[PDB]
RNA sequence: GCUUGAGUCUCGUAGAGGGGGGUAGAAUUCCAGGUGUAGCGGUGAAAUGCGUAGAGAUCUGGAGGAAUACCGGUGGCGAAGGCGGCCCCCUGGACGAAGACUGACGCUCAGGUGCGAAAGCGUGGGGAGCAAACAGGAUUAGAUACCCUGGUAGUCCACGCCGUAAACGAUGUCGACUUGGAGGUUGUGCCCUUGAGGCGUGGCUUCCGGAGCUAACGCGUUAAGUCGACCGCCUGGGGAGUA
RNA sequence: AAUAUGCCAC
């Protein structure tokens, strides 16, 4: 659950508009800041199995979405994960 | 800044030392910046049942928007305060201004 | 030998056995009675008849400490809750209060295993 | 006869109106049945919250023989 | 269960009045539920069936409402 | 940090050794050393009164302050050192008015945590206080038995001792053993436990790590002769005594305090 | 390219969903003491056991561990195993309303990885109650059982391992379509909240039953009905899920 | 409360 600041604010600056919160760069963002979010969580309730499955389970969707764009516009994703800093 | 109701009940020999807890304790809550919405003294009332063999005790209400931090201390106030015999500190989903029904 | 006028009466009557106690408002025993200690053995020491012999005998053992009310207070689940009342009353003795204080923990450990019988 | 929280539109049971609160528990200090008392389901589980809370506040009983 | 003789209250009246509160209370039933454990398996089990007579029993009711036997 | 060893060799096959990074790497603080000479068990007589005991690797002595006298004076934990001394680490802590100084390493501590010694001090972990002050319940070390003589009590490592009660002038505290003891209220005492409680899952792993440690071999009573131990003696593996000390005293049970000056401040046994 | 699949954002919602920390009262047990006597406890009866060294009962004050009566509900949440006192911190999922956004980003999944009741294992603690093992009494032809009286591991915690259960709605996951009725629970809209009313619409869930299906029993819009996608699995019984 | 068993074609 990232903040609705944060969330504006990665809106803003990832996505053409302040209304573009579908947009794939967007998504991709909001699942990277949540998933280093909630690192830290995990780091001292390594027992928190059911809270690391909706992490797991964001993991895979910006795994997916990182597919998808990159079988699409491969410039965009090279972008983003450069922007990121996710190594694939 | 989350809406905390904060209610702590006294041992009956230090009712007169009970305004200076509130004083002490809504300054705190200022100096955090944190912002008192409500408080009320509902005096000294009798127990429902024996809380260490005291059956009467001297009960404060108030409620802050004070940070989670000092809301911490607070709760390290009462834990280590021996004349606060009982203390509860609830999330609230929005700040009360109201009259509490004991008043 | 001291005067109390107003006692306790504790009846605590389990599946097998009634005990009786008088008492002052204190909890000190004045006296006491039991199902087994009224000629009563095996199938026969845990019916409410041997529960009002029982407390008809207490009722008769304290009788000099000059007792006129009694407070009662029932442990228990026992057939003892009933007769020891009546035959306290048939007794003599004034009851003002008729309490239940059966143990009932608020979960508390863990009863023993259910018998196969 | 039905809940008296819908039938206000008040819904949540605040725990410290001891006097609504005694509405709801038998004079041996329990919580009195939804099906008894005609509460909803939501309106009972907020009741139950307050009661206990009461409890642990010493407002209520947690049973008549202490 | 605490009750209260009252003024002018004989003492029949009194021990009735008691058994009610004590029933009302429910002591014994919990007191014979609590003599054993019974495990966790079979307090669903008994759960369960308990509310399946019920319903059973109460669609039987008023279903043979709807039945003429003699 | 507990680290098991590789089997690369018979003598490390089996050792277990607590590594804990926080440990200062360099040389002790110099101005609070002395000298430490061993013994070997022997007294002023040159007897050896406490047998199994020499050799060993040469140590120094590090001045700990047990009595955490200078009170309502802030210090802060400059580093944790390593005390061949004793099972606990030790902290060295420099006041404000720049005194540096040695105390017991309590669990939870590092370099820049603040303490404080006094009766205003904070009632958090590291300070010192007198358990007329120290709340009901604590977990506290370093206690000290007699007013100011200094802490006596739990100060190995990992230890605690908790305050159970207070009864005007006393308190009575539970101790590791499971003593049950009663303290005068002024004597001083410690917050939290003391560090270093991985120590006891170390393994040494071969007859040369308890060497190290001048800890000299163990014969068994009943290897000796008869004129030299009551077990000794027998063709072949015998026994049939009851099993006692070197010198008679039966040594499985038979109990041996003996101190009515103060069995008064005993309230339970460990038993 | 498009948006109706899929997903994101905005507002709220209900919940024993999870992890951490604290605390509350009831109760059993034990310890110290007071009153107080000869029984208690147990059973189908009985005896072992406890007790005149003063038990049981009753009262006061402590200690400690475990579990959370009532609420409590074929109620709720969770992928499953499972989760129920109260409070706080961190946190996952579901859902509803209106709009905007991205534009097939989807479904399944061999091998792989994670989670996975209870029992069990390793280390360090803890240990009230219960209780395999064990011992005694009884029952019996015998009774290494049921019953009784005690009782250790273990149940409890931290970490690690095991990886199995009638792990079961004996029903793989996803999607579409196909008469109903009575509920339960959670939102949301209209009016009249004109008496907590009706009138709709979503989500999940319980019972009965229609067509159809099934060997029958039964399932029956939460299909075992009519179809599509992918995976797993079966090929007489025993041997054997063993070597 | 205890109440074990039933081999000779059909
Ligand atoms: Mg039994
Ligand atoms: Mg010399
Ligand atoms: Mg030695
Ligand atoms: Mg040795
Ligand atoms: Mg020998
Ligand atoms: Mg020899
Ligand atoms: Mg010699
Ligand atoms: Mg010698
Ligand atoms: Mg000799
Ligand atoms: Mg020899
Ligand atoms: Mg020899
Ligand atoms: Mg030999
Ligand atoms: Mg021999
Ligand atoms: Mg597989
Ligand atoms: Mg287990
Ligand atoms: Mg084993
Ligand atoms: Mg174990
Ligand atoms: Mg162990
Ligand atoms: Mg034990
Ligand atoms: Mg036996
Ligand atoms: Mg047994
Ligand atoms: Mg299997
Ligand atoms: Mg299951
Ligand atoms: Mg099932
Ligand atoms: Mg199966
Ligand atoms: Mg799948
Ligand atoms: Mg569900
Ligand atoms: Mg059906
Ligand atoms: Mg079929
Ligand atoms: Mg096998």
Redesign the interface.
């Known amino acids: 659950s990232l903040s609705t600041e944060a969330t504006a604010k990665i809106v803003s600056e990832f996505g053409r508009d302040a209304n573009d919160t579908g947009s794939t760069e967007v998504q991709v963002a909001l699942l990277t800041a949540q998933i280093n979010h909630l690192q830290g969580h995990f780091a001292e309730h390594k027992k928190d199995h059911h809270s690391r499955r909706g992490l797991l389970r964001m993991v895979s969707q910006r795994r997916k979405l990182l597919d998808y764009l990159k079988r699409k516009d491969v410039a965009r994703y090279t972008q983003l994960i450069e922007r990121l800093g996710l190594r694939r | 800044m989350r809406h905390y109701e904060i209610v702590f009940m006294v041992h009956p020999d230090q009712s007169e030392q009970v305004p200076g807890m509130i004083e002490r304790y809504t300054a705190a809550i200022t100096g955090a910046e944190g912002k008192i919405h409500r408080l009320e003294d509902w005096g000294r009332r009798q127990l429902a049942y024996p809380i260490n063999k005291l059956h009467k005790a001297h009960y404060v209400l108030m409620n802050v928007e004070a940070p989670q931090e000092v809301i911490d201390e607070l709760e390290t106030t009462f834990r280590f305060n021996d004349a606060v015999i009982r203390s509860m500190v609830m999330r609230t989903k929005h700040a009360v201004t109201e009259a509490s029904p004991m008043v | 030998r001291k005067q109390v006028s107003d006692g306790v009466a504790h009846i605590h009557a389990s599946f097998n056995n009634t005990i009786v106690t008088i008492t002052d408002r204190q909890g000190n025993a004045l006296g006491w009675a039991t199902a087994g200690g009224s000629g009563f053995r095996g199938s026969r020491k845990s019916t409410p008849f041997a529960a009002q012999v029982a407390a008809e005998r207490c009722a008769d053992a304290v009788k000099e400490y000059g007792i006129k009310n009694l407070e009662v207070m029932v442990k228990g689940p026992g057939p003892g809750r009933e007769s020891t009342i009546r035959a306290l009353n048939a007794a003599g003795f004034r009851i003002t209060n008729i309490t239940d204080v059966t143990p009932i923990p608020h979960x508390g450990c863990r009863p023993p295993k259910k018998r196969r019988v | 006869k039905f809940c008296r929280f819908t039938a206000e539109g008040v819904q949540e049971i605040d725990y410290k109106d001891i006097a609504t609160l005694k509405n709801y528990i038998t004079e041996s200090g329990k919580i009195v049945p939804s099906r008894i008392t005609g509460t909803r389901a939501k309106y009972q589980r907020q009741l139950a919250r307050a009661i206990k809370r009461a409890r642990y506040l010493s407002l209520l009983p947690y049973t008549d023989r202490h | 269960?605490?009750?209260?003789?009252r003024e002018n209250e004989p003492?029949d009246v009194?021990?009735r009045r008691?058994?009610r509160?004590?029933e009302?209370?429910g002591?014994?039933a919990?007191?014979?539920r609590?003599?054993?454990?019974?495990k966790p398996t079979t307090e669903r089990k008994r759960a369960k069936a308990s509310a399946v007579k019920r319903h059973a029993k109460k669609l039987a009711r008023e279903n043979a409402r709807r039945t003429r036997l003699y | 940090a507990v680290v098991k060893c590789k089997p690369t060799s018979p003598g490390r096959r089996h050792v277990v050794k607590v590594v804990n990074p926080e440990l200062h790497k360099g040389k002790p603080f110099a101005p609070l050393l002395e000298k430490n000479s061993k013994s070997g068990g022997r007294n002023n007589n040159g007897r050896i009164t406490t047998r199994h005991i020499g050799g060993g690797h040469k140590q120094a002595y590090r001045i700990v302050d047990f009595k955490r006298n200078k009170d309502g004076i802030p210090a802060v934990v400059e580093r944790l050192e390593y005390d061949p001394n004793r099972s606990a680490n030790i902290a060295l802590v420099l006041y404000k008015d720049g005194e540096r100084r040695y105390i017991l390493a309590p669990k939870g501590l590092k370099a820049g945590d603040q303490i404080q010694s006094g009766v205003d001090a904070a009632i958090k972990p590291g300070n010192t206080l007198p358990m007329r002050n120290i709340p009901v319940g604590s977990t506290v070390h370093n206690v000290e038995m007699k007013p100011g003589k200094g802490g006596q009590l739990a100060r190995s490592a990992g230890t605690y001792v908790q305050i159970v009660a207070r009864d005007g002038a006393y308190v009575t505290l539970r101790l590791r053993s499971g003593e049950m003891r009663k303290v005068e209220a002024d004597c001083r005492a410690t917050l939290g436990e003391v560090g270093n409680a991985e120590h006891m899952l170390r393994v040494l792993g071969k007859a040369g790590a308890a060497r190290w440690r001048g800890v000299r071999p163990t014969v068994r009573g009943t290897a000796m002769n008869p004129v030299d131990h009551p077990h000794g003696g027998g063709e072949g593996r015998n026994f049939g005594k009851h099993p006692v000390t070197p010198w008679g005293v039966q040594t499985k049970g038979k109990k041996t305090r003996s101190n009515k000056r103060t069995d008064k401040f005993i309230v339970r046994r460990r038993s």
């Open positions: 269960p605490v009750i209260k003789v003492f009194a021990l008691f058994k509160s004590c009302k209370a002591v014994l919990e007191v014979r609590r003599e054993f454990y019974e």
